[PDB]
C-alpha cells in the first residue's frame, strides 16, 4: 500500500517548503517517498536535490521528441534520504493552459511504473489559486486521496482553502478524494492558531499542525536544503517532525463542508485578525 | 479618448484594494472611471458600491436565460464618485476554466456600448497567478493597453510580475499592450522600495508608487469603503492620491525584458530581504 497525498494552497503560502521538509522528516523516519511537482514555478524539489530546480517532463519530452521517448530512469531523480523527485512543468505564460503539464506528467508516471510497491507516500505539490485544468486533475481523476491545504490567517489563504474544498465536494460521487487537514503556516499573528482550528471545524476537518514562522527556513533554503538536513537540531526541524508524525497517524479524511464568504468574514472578525 | 488599464498581480497582493482606492482618487479628481472585475473572488467593486460584493455577469446571465437577455443598464452599478462597476464571475471550482467568465464579460461590455466616449479610464482587476484562458485575454486580445503590476518584496510576487511580463512580450507583435509600471504594496520590510525599483529597472519599467502598509485600510474595508471615502484626511488617502496623479501623468509604456530566476534570487540576496 502507498498513500497518495496532495498539498494545495495559494501561491507563496508555503506549499513547497512545507512539503519538502515534511517529506525529509518522513525519509528520516525510514519512509520511501516520491514528490511530484505540479506547480509551473517548478522549484518543488530543489531542497531535496540540492539544486537550482529540476528540468521538467515538458522540457525533457521536447528535447527527446515525444514523452514516449523518455525513460523513467532518466526522469526521476533521488536526493536527501532517497526521496524521488519529478517536476511536471507547463507552458509559458500566455500559451495554452497553465496546468496542461500536470496531466502529461501524472499519466507518464503511471504508465511507466513509477508507483512501485515499495513506495510509502507520494506527495503532489499543486498550485491552488485556480481549481481547473491540470490543477484540478489530481482531484477530478482520483490521483490524490488525501488533500492537505496549507493556509494562514490571511483571508486569501482561507478563501483558497474553501475553494479547494468545493472542488473536493464536486467530485465526491466517484473516486475517494478527501480532505485530510489544514496546515497553518504562521504569519506570526495573534490567535492565528485558533482561527485555523475554527476554520477547520467549520469545514469538518482539523488543523493537523501549526508551523511557526522561523528564519532558519531562509538560511537552509539559501543553501538549497530542507531544515531537516541543514540543522537537524533546530526547533523548526522538530516542528516538521511533529507534522510528519501526525500525517502518518491521521485517519480523518472527510468530504468537507464549504462555507460562505459571510462565515469567512465572521471568523476573521471573531479572532481579531 | 479613454485609457484602458489593467491591474495584475498574485492573489492577496493588494490588487482590489489598490485599484478601488486609486479609482476613488481619480473620481475625486473629476475623472469618469469604470472598474471591470476579472478575478473569480468577485469582490473587486465592493468598496465603491458599499456592498458585500456585486452579482456577476455569469450569475445574471444564468437567471435571465442568455447573456444576450441582459441589458447593460441592469448590469453596471455606480457607487462612490460615480464610478461604474461590473464583475465577470466565473465557474465554480473544479468546473471548466476559471477564466471563462472574463471573456464573456468583456465581450458583453463591448457589444452593449459600455465604452462610452465620456469615460476617462477603464481598470480591469485581473487574477495573475496563471496567465492563461480568460485571465490572459486582456493581453492576448488587446483590451488593456497599460498594465500595472502590484507586487512586494515577496519572491512569489516578483515571480508573478515576471510571468505577466512574459505574457506581454508574447503578444507584442500585434496590438499595443505594454507594461506601465510596478506598484509596490509594502510588507513593511527594509529596502523593499529599493528592491522593487531595481526589479522595475531590470524589466525596463519603473516603480510608479510605493504604497505603505497601513491599518486604516482594514478599518475602511470593515465599513465597505475606500480610504479615500472613509477618511479623506488619512495619510494613506494622500498615498493613493499620489499614485493616481502618477498614473494620470505616466508616459512610459514598454515591452518589458523578463529576467531569469537567477536574476530574481540575486535581487533578493542583494537587498538583504
Ligand atoms: N515556516 C516558515 N518560516 C519561514 N519562512 C517560510 C516558512 N514557510 C515558507 N517560508 C518561505 O516562504 C516563501 C514561500 O514558500 P513556498 O513553499 O515557496 O510557497 P509556495 O510553494 O506555496 O509558493 C519561501 O521563501 C519560503 O522560504
Ligand atoms: N496598503 C495596505 N495596507 C494594509 N492592508 C492592505 C493594503 N493593501 C491591501 N491590504 C489588505 O490586504 C488584503 C488583500 O488585498 P486585496 O486587494 O483583496 O488583494 P487581491 O485583490 O490582490 O487578492 C486585504 O485584506 C486588504 O485590506
Ligand atoms: S484558467 Fe488557465 S487555461 Fe483555464
Ligand atoms: S489553468 Fe485554468 S483551465 Fe487552464
Ligand atoms: Mg511552490
Ligand atoms: Mg481582488
**DSSP state letters, B33-89:** EEEEEESTT--TTHHHHTSS----HHHHHHHHSSGGG--HHHH-EE-GGG-EEEE--
Q: Alpha-carbon torsion A15, A16, A20, A21, what sign?
A: negative
Contact B187, B152 (CB under 8 A): yes
B129–A130 C-beta distance less than 8 A: yes
Give me the sign of the Cα torsion angle A188, A194, A197, A201: negative
Q: How far apart are CA B5 and CA A241, in angstroms?
A: 48
Per CB-CB distance under 8 Å, the chain B contacts of A157 are 12
In sequence order, what are the beta bridge partners of A209?
A183
Q: Which of B15, B93, B188, B189 to mutate to test the interface with A (most CBs of A within 10 A)?
A: B93
Identify residues after which chain A is interrupted (C–N over 2.5 A).
none
Contact A82, A27 (CB under 8 A): yes
CA distances from A185 to A150, A213, A235, A273, B1 (A): 7, 7, 15, 15, 47
The residues facing A126 across adjacent strands are A38
Known catalytic residues of A? 10, 15, 41, 129
User: What span, in angstroms and rounded, lies between the C-alpha atoms of A87 and A125?
Assistant: 10
| Whole-number CA gyration radius for chain A | 18
Distance A131 CA to ligand 3 centre (A): 9
Among the partner residues A157, A170, A262, nearest to B94 by beta-carbon distance: A170
Cα separation, A15 vs A109, in Å, equals 22
Helical segments of chain B, H only = 15-28, 46-49, 57-64, 72-75, 100-111, 133-140, 155-170, 192-203, 216-222, 227-230, 235-249, 261-270
Please state, in angstroms and rounded to a whole number, the distance separating the CA atoms of residues A110 and B84: 51
Question: Which residues are within 8 A (CB) of A199 and not within 5 positions of it... i.e. 6 or more apart?
Answer: A151, A158, A161, A182, A259, A264, A267
With CA atoms as reference, report the closest residue to A254 among A183, A186, A165: A165
Instruction: State which approach was used to obtain the coordinates.
Output: X-ray
Spatial distance between the Cα atoms of B200 and B258, rounded to a whole number of angstroms: 10
Task: Check if the beta carbon of residue B256 is closer than 8 Å to that of residue B204.
Answer: yes
- 3 state DSSP class of A125: strand
Question: Which strand (E) or helix (H) includes residue A8?
Answer: strand A3-8
Answer whether A97 sits within 8 Å of B171, measured CB to CB: no
Chain A residues within an 8 Å CB radius of B166:
92-94
Q: How many CA atoms within 13 Å lie on the side-chain side of A250?
A: 27
Q: B53 vs A261: CB contact, 8 Å cut-off?
A: yes
DSSP code at position B172: T
Resolution for this PDB entry, in angstroms: 1.4
Residues 6 or more apart whose CB falls under 8 angstroms from that of B59 comprise B89
Q: How far is CA A240 from CA A20, A29, A151, in A?
A: 10, 12, 16
CA distances (Å), origin A4, targets A115, A139, A238, B106: 10, 11, 24, 41
Give CB contacts under 8 A, 24+ apart, made by A193-202: A194/A271, A195/A153, A195/A267, A195/A268, A195/A270, A195/A271, A195/A273, A196/A151, A196/A152, A196/A153, A198/A267, A198/A270, A198/A271, A199/A151, A199/A158, A199/A161, A199/A259, A199/A264, A199/A267, A202/A257, A202/A259, A202/A263, A202/A267
* Residue-wise burial string across A33-60, b where 16 or more C-beta atoms lie within 10 A, e elsewhere: bbbbbbbbbbbbbbbbbeeebbebbbeb
What is the rounded distance in angstroms from the CA atom of residue B17 to the CA atom of residue B218?
A: 10
Amino acid at each position: 500500500a502507498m498513500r497518495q497525498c496532495a498539498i494545495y494552497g495559494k501561491g507563496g503560502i508555503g506549499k513547497s517548503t512545507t512539503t519538502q521538509n515534511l517529506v525529509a522528516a518522513l525519509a528520516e523516519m525510514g519512509k520511501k517517498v516520491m514528490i511530484v511537482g505540479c506547480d509551473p514555478k517548478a522549484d518543488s524539489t530543489r531542497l531535496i536535490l540540492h539544486s537550482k530546480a529540476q528540468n521538467t517532463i515538458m522540457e525533457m519530452a521536447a528535447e527527446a521528441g515525444t514523452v514516449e521517448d523518455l525513460e523513467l530512469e532518466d526522469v526521476l531523480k533521488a536526493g536527501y534520504g532517497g526521496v524521488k523527485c519529478v517536476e511536471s512543468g507547463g507552458p509559458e505564460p500566455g500559451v495554452g493552459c497553465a496546468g496542461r503539464g500536470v496531466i502529461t506528467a501524472i499519466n507518464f508516471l503511471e504508465e511507466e511504473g513509477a508507483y512501485e510497491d515499495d513506495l510509502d507516500f507520494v506527495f503532489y505539490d499543486v498550485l491552488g489559486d485556480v481549481v481547473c485544468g491540470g490543477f484540478a486533475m489530481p482531484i477530478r481523476e482520483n490521483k490524490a486521496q488525501e488533500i492537505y491545504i496549507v493556509c494562514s490567517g490571511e483571508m486569501m489563504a482561507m478563501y483558497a482553502a474553501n475553494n479547494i474544498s468545493k472542488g473536493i465536494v464536486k467530485y465526491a460521487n466517484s473516486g475517494s478524494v478527501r480532505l485530510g487537514g489544514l496546515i497553518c503556516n504562521s504569519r506570526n499573528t495573534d490567535r492565528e492558531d485558533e482561527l485555523i482550528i475554527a476554520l477547520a471545524n467549520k469545514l469538518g476537518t482539523q488543523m493537523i499542525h501549526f508551523v511557526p514562522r522561523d528564519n532558519v527556513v531562509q538560511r537552509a533554503e539559501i543553501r538549497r536544503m530542507t531544515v531537516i538536513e541543514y540543522d537537524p537540531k533546530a526547533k523548526q526541524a522538530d516542528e516538521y517532525r511533529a507534522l510528519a508524525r501526525k500525517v502518518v497517524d491521521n485517519k480523518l479524511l472527510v468530504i468537507p463542508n464549504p462555507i460562505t464568504m459571510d462565515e469567512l468574514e465572521e471568523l476573521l472578525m471573531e479572532f481579531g485578525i
